[PDB]
Structure 1
Amino acid sequence: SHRKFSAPRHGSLGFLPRKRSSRHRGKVKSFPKDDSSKPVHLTAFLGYKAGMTHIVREVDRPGSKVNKKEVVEAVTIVETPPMIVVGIVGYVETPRGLRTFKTIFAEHISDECKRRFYKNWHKSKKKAFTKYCKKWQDAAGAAALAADFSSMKAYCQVIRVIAHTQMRLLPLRQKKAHLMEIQVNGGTVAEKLDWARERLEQQVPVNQVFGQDEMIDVIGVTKGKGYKGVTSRWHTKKLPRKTHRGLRKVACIGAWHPARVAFSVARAGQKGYHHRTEINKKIYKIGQGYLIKDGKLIKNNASTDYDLSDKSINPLGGFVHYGEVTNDFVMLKGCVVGTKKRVLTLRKSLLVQTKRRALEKIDLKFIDTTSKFGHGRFQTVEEKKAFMGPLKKD
């Protein structure tokens, strides 16, 4: 017979080889279509989720109840030190797919970049890229990497740039840099290419990839939660109190005549640590790490013009569970996938964004920096000694 009272299904099938993700750094599965008229730029970046906080801003969407009112928005902060370019890679279009031509790494490489090459490091001799680097000064310093750029100029169509993070500038215990191919959505290969030939061994800060109030996509790995019941995983109903054998299950799996349990029935399994691609997140502010000209420009982190304190986005006691953010960052509206410290990939929008809620230029009026290690009550440490004042420990 049929279902008495119809109801939607629990949880989308559009996600459902719901397994522990096979990668860790968020892999970009599609880069934006390269319009070959606009100048050359990078399409992706690589940041680290740090924490969250309150924002205060004025709204401009006329006709709404909250036009010219102040709202609070929760924002993540993605600590994003400048990435380093090490190599370029060519791709050529085939019927069978999109094959890779020619990877050409620079003369130097790094130290952090070597880490990403061997599982155990301190046991090894650190020999990676020790004879490829030899090519970059001799007669063959023209054969294998000057006829190659001419080859990648003749037959290549799409050119990405292999670029690794700097793991030494972060508070993290990791030192294995994160490499990633970041496609160059410029125009005219050989201009797409005689730009990355230049930026070999070079820094790339976040203000080159991304601009303020730009719709990007965040590509990371869900927070992990282990084996979970059908009730947590697929968010089913709980059976009534009286059920003899468990009440956190699905009473009926399937019907008798399809003698297999179906692909789409809810089951217990791993939950969390899936790969997800969040789209259409907005940037509220591109940051700038506390650099030195005389000393410690911590001011230029959370000092919006409307309050002009000298806060760093670091709250009191740093961002709980992760540390203090000390270089550039991007402030994102709402929540991003992943836990603290997770490697986050930041892609530019594949959509032509022309809505009213987007394109909305943003003015920060106050950035909350009170401690997240409990119920913080007051923002900066000097303000603490404006209240209570002289403590006993003096």
Structure 2
Amino acid sequence: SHRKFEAPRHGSLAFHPRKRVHKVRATVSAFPKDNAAEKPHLTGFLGFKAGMTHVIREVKRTNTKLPKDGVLEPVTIIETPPMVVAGFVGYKKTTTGLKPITAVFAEHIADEFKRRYTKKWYKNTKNQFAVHTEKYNDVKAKSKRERQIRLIKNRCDVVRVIAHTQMALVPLKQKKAEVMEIQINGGSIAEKVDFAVSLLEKQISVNSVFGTDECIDVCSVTKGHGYNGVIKRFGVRHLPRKTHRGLRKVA
């Protein structure tokens, strides 16, 4: 038969299946569409949320009925210490999506970036980025770097910088840095790399990425709630009190 009275379905089907993530950081799955007629610019950052607080904001809009005194609004304070660029990677568009062609890395790598390549640092010999650093200036291993740059300028369409946070400036107990690939959107690939190479080992501050009164698309991983029933998870109607074998479930 037909349901007696029609109702809006509970929960969203665009998120099924509801699989919890593993890595705490949420990878940004898409970057703004590249515009080829502007100076190259970073299109992202990475900050650690701290909390929330309320503000009284003066209304600067037109033809609105909000009080002239102020509007009480909630804000969120995201602490973002400057990040350190530690290389870059050039992607290429093939018939199976992007394909990372090469990846050039800086010389001096901080100990907060080496930790990401190990699962037990206190026993690890901590030899990460050692052969790369010791042979950085050799002529054989300098032509290889110059070869990688010419490969990217010729057979690549997307350039991203492998920037990592600094964990000594945040009160978190974690020590290893969090690595993010921030795409560069701007002029042709000739000047993207020249911009990416100019950023190596150089700290980047948030004001060089974002601007005042700019809207952004925050991407993150929600709060953890563990096993939950049907009433909390989806929102169905709790059954009457008389019910046998319990109430809070789908019938």
- Per the TM superposition, whether the score is higher than 0.5 is yes
Match of 1:329 in 2: none
**Is the contact between residue 86 and residue 201 of structure 1 (CA under 8 Å) also seen in structure 2?**
yes
- Counterpart check, 1:66 vs 2:66: yes
Match of 2:180 in 1: 180
**Is the contact between residue 85 and residue 161 of structure 1 (CA under 8 Å) also seen in structure 2?**
yes
Match of 1:315 in 2: none
CA offsets, 1:141-197, max 9 Å, x none?
332100110111111110011000001100110101000110001211121000111
TM-score (norm 1): 0.63
2:84 counterpart letter in structure 1 = I
Match of 2:142 in 1: 142
More helix by share: 2
Match of 1:23 in 2: 23
The gaps in structure 2 that reach 5 residues or longer are: none
Match of 1:192 in 2: 192
Map 1:357-368 to 2 at 5 A. none
CA offsets, 1:54-88, max 9 Å, x none?
11111122222116331111101000000000010
Map 1:86-97 to 2 at 5 A. 86-97=86-97
Q: Which runs of 4+ in 1 moved over 6 A?
A: none
**Is the contact between residue 60 and residue 67 of structure 1 (CA under 8 Å) also seen in structure 2?**
no
Q: Counterparts of 1:94 and 1:67 in 2: how far apart (Å)?
A: 55
1:131 counterpart letter in structure 2 = V
3-state SS of paired residue (1:195): helix
Match of 2:237 in 1: 237
Match of 2:201 in 1: 201
Q: Counterparts of 1:10 and 1:31 in 2: how far apart (Å)?
A: 31
Q: May I ask how many residue pairs the two structures share in their alignment?
A: 251
3-state SS of paired residue (1:193): helix
1:194 counterpart letter in structure 2 = D
Match of 1:6 in 2: 6
Map 1:255-266 to 2 at 5 A. none
Q: Counterparts of 1:236 and 1:23 in 2: how far apart (Å)?
A: 31
Map 1:1-394 to 2 at 5 A. 1-66=1-66, 68-251=68-251
3-state SS of paired residue (1:192): helix
The gaps in structure 1 that reach 5 residues or longer are: 252-394
TM-score (norm 2): 0.97
Q: Counterparts of 2:70 and 2:133 in 1: how far apart (Å)?
A: 56
CA offsets, 1:12-32, max 9 Å, x none?
101111111133211110001
CA offsets, 1:84-141, max 9 Å, x none?
0001001011012111100111111111111111111011110111111233211123
Pairwise CA RMSD: 1.0
3-state SS of paired residue (2:143): coil
Deviates more, 1:13-22 or 1:155-164: 13-22
